[PDB]
Design a protein around this nucleic acid. Structure first.
Ligand SMILES: [Mg+2]
Ligand SMILES: [Mg+2]
Ligand SMILES: [Zn+2]
Lengths: 125, 124, 95, 234, 109
RNA sequence: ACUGCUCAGUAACACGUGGAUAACCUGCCCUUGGGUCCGGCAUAACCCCGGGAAACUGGGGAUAAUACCGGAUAACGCACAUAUGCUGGAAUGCUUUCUGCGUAAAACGGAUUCGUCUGCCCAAGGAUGGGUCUGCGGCCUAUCAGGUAGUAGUGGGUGUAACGUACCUACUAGCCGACAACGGGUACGGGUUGUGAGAGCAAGAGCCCGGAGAUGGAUUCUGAGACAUGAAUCCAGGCCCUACGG
């Protein structure tokens, strides 16, 4: 659980005095980070019967060659780097926009594993 | 002083027994799922598996919970809880599978049968 | 007591006749059974079949509004008309 | 899902008498703004049943049909140009918007008559289908001849196409809002004025003016193809 | 995106690889179009813009000019200057206070 | 989770009003396009024995469904090529799509006059409900002058129904204010009401619209939807039934 309601001052620093409680629709879940392990997923429910698939661990990827446009599933070994956080590279976290290392070759994750339910990585040219 | 309830699966017949003394002390410590010799019941080779219990104040034992004492449980379903509303959680008082001197009733079932009849081996 | 009838629309969706008339009574406002007995002869409707919903008398002048109705079946009346109307309308031999 | 006596919609001609709620219309296919309950229609306009229970009885017994569909619910919405058919008297009525934006009923002559609809968004269902954002009846998932706002006409109750009433310059047009509601007249110029809100249209019937493209109905080639105006019975 | 039609406010002579750039990016600009001047452009991709108008007071029957500040998105291809008249149109929320992106920044004359 | 009540909090996109959502969810309802495929077999009341001051509630025996589980034909996300389909400044969407890579549903249920009626799944859209969004409109105060560091913004992310510092990271050094920020005072907002010849001035208890609240407070289950007025959980606070174990 996290609160994603509109609570960060107004424009100036005058502390916004809340007139409403923490509503149910403003409650966001936890960042279920993904690592390189046994491929584990959970069918967490969301609004309107939309069970969003959340991934937690994975050592395989759907590496997509751009030269020929062929999709083959190759194992994930290590995150090469990541622009979003300099610590996920050390933690082997698999976020979107990171760069993983597969058997096919180095690839960049182009899918959000916490929302997509799979690790779809485009093979870097 | 245990007020044991024993049921027969072959006829769906439950015999209520009032037991005391050394046999009651033998029943103490026997967790849920234990098998007990019929000499504690006097039955000719009838072995009973204990599958329940409750306190003097009506608190029901739980086979799930390990430990003899009481615990507070915020459950949403299971043994000894009925949801008044659909998917409602409550904090009841349950017991472990361990048998205690503050336990009255011991529900159990007949498993390993004996030579004689079940009824006639208790004077009936 | 006198009666003149103006509107006799028949509802095709229920097979009943809507009786609208002006009650030219004198003095004492007639009861529902009496107005039914008078309104029966105007359109050939039995007491069990002819039904009246109000004989509402206005101020001053002795004129009343009569919203009576006619059915081709008493079971249809019991299925459609409310129970207070069935009690309020005395059947032949009713108590 | 309630609505009160005071906050009854502007398109609802029925007054502000009674006690709070007046017959909450369902979600339905049509907009709730231009909608009246079938129970309110049969209890106020036509006057075939006076109570709500008797209205629910007559609806439930398959006695009233809305484009050949005998709806048993008294909360069904009704949109503009909707036909109500009663076979027992041959009473045909059409939902119409008068000059004040309110919804009324005009009686028709024949029981069997078409119904007019409109195109609002042509999307593509997977399977090579040009979905027209239909909401009522059956239709034809057609081709690019069927454009937006084309105002299709379809039969009843089978709801097959009768004639593609495509609009052009000079063709007929009926207003569906504003202060010009019900002033049907020929189209003068349908200008595709680019802007962030929506485009515009030029229409002149008895008197010329400018009107919005969401307040125009392509109701005929030169003359009324559908039975637009019959008898305005309350 | 970069599309030329009547009253287009056409895409500039400079290409921008911005994600929120209306002509070259993928941000659909839509809403209410407005006009203003850059109060200051000391902030990345965001020019504070002032709207100046007047509200006639009913009782006194006179006027009072009212200032107002708006934060707009300043794409690099446009690059709205300092104190220049510019037309802004609404977009989806870019940031904490950014729902407008500038589309035409004309240096004043 | 609709009504119903209250009017504490709230000086606020809370509200009135004009737009937007091409940034989103929607059970019931709506029309068209499809489908409705194999199974598995618990556990209820009931039977036999109770425990319990109560609140509650145990065991063994029998069993059913539109209950629940397992299996086949989609959606979801990556990468592609393919023709205006809407809207149109405007794709970013639908997409003809197909490609391969991970990746799914239903109750051939019920009734009948066997005419049919009503239900399950599914795709597209609508409608309904609600979140979000911003131009503008409306208090007293200087015996209230600086306020703000997640504060202002950029890139990459994260979570979300969805856009978003909503959270996180690297970075920039901004942002609001003397045309009143920040603080204090006060207040449910508006439609309106009082009064006067009017300009105005004063209040916005009741009828309708939206907002919030459930002893004060935090947290959570269930559900299409709630942090639920007749849901829970604990703390504070008061009270209450007890066979004193609750
Ligand atoms: Mg949920
Ligand atoms: Mg924001
Ligand atoms: Zn650009």
């Amino acid at each position: 659980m996290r609160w994603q309601g509109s609570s960060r001052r107004k424009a100036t620093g005058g502390k916004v005095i809340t007139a409403r409680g923490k509503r149910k629709f403003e409650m966001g879940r936890e960042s279920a980070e993904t690592r390189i392990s046994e491929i584990k997923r959970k069918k967490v429910p969301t609004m309107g019967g939309n069970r969003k698939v959340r991934l937690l661990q994975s050592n395989v990827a759907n590496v997509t060659n751009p030269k020929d446009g062929k999709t083959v599933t190759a194992p994930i070994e290590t995150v090469i780097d990541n622009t979003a956080n300099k610590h996920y590279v050390r933690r082997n976290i698999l976020t979107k926009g990171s760069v993983i290392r597969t058997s096919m070759g180095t690839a960049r994750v182009t899918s959000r594993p916490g929302q997509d339910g799979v690790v779809n990585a485009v093979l870097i040219e | 002083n245990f007020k044991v309830v024993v049921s027969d699966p072959k006829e769906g017949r439950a015999y209520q027994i009032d037991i005391k003394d050394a046999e009651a002390n033998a029943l103490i410590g026997k967790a849920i799922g234990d098998v007990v010799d019929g000499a504690i019941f006097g039955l000719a080779g009838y072995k009973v598996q204990i599958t329940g219990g409750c306190d003097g104040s009506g608190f029901v034992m739980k086979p799930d919970l390990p430990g003899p004492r009481r615990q507070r449980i915020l459950t949403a379903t299971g043994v000894g809880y009925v949801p008044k509303l659909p998917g409602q959680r409550r904090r009841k008082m349950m017991r472990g599978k361990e048998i205690a001197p503050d336990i009255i009733q011991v529900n159990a079932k007949i498993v390993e049968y004996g030579s004689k009849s079940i009824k006639a081996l208790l004077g009936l | 007591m006198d009666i003149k009838i103006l509107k006799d629309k028949n509802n095709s969706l229920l097979n009943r006749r809507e009786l609208d008339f002006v009650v030219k009574y004198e003095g004492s406002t007639p009861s529902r059974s009496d107005v039914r007995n008078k309104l029966a002869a105007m359109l050939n409707a039995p007491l069990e079949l002819l039904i009246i919903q109000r004989i509402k008398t206005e101020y001053g002048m002795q004129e009343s509004k009569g919203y009576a109705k006619v059915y081709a079946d008493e079971a249809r009346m019991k299925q459609v008309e409310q129970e207070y109307i069935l009690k309020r309308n005395p059947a032949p031999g009713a108590e | 899902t309630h609505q009160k006596r005071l906050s009854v919609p502007k398109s609802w001609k029925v007054g502000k008498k009674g006690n709070k709620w007046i017959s909450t219309t369902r979600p339905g296919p049509h907009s709730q703004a231009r909608s009246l309950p079938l129970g309110i229609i049969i209890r106020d306009i036509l006057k075939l049943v006076d109570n709500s229970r008797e209205g629910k009885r007559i609806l439930s017994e398959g006695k009233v049909l809305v484009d050949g569909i005998p709806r048993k619910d008294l909360r069904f919405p009704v949109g503009l140009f909707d036909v109500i058919t009663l076979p027992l008297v041959n009473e045909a009525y059409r939902m119409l918007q008068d000059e004040k934006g309110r919804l009324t009923l005009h009686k028709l002559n024949e029981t069997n008559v078409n119904k007019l609809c409109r195109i609002n968004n042509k999307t593509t269902v997977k399977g090579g289908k040009f979905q027209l954002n239909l909401n009522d009846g059956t239709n034809i998932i057609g081709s690019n001849e069927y454009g937006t706002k084309d105002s299709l006409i379809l039969s009843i109750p089978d709801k097959q196409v009768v004639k593609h009433l495509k609009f052009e310059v000079g063709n007929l047009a009926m207003v569906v809002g504003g202060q010009h509601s019900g002033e049907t007249g020929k189209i003068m110029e349908i200008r595709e004025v680019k802007s962030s809100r929506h485009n515009t249209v030029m229409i002149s019937g008895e008197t010329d003016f400018e009107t919005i493209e969401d307040y125009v109905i392509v109701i005929g080639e030169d003359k009324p193809e559908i039975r637009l105006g019959g008898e305005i019975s309350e | 995106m970069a599309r030329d039609i009547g009253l287009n406010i056409p895409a500039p002579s400079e290409e921008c690889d911005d994600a929120y750039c209306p002509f070259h990016g993928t941000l659909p600009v839509r809403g209410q179009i407005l006009v203003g001047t850059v109060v200051s452009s000391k902030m990345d991709n965001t020019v504070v813009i002032e709207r100046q108008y007047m509200k006639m007071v009913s009782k006194y029957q006179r006027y009072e000019k009212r200032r107002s500040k708006i934060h707009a998105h300043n794409p690099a291809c446009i690059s709205a200057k300092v104190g220049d008249i510019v037309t802004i149109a609404e977009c989806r929320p870019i940031s904490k206070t950014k729902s407008y992106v500038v589309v035409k920044a004309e240096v004043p004359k």
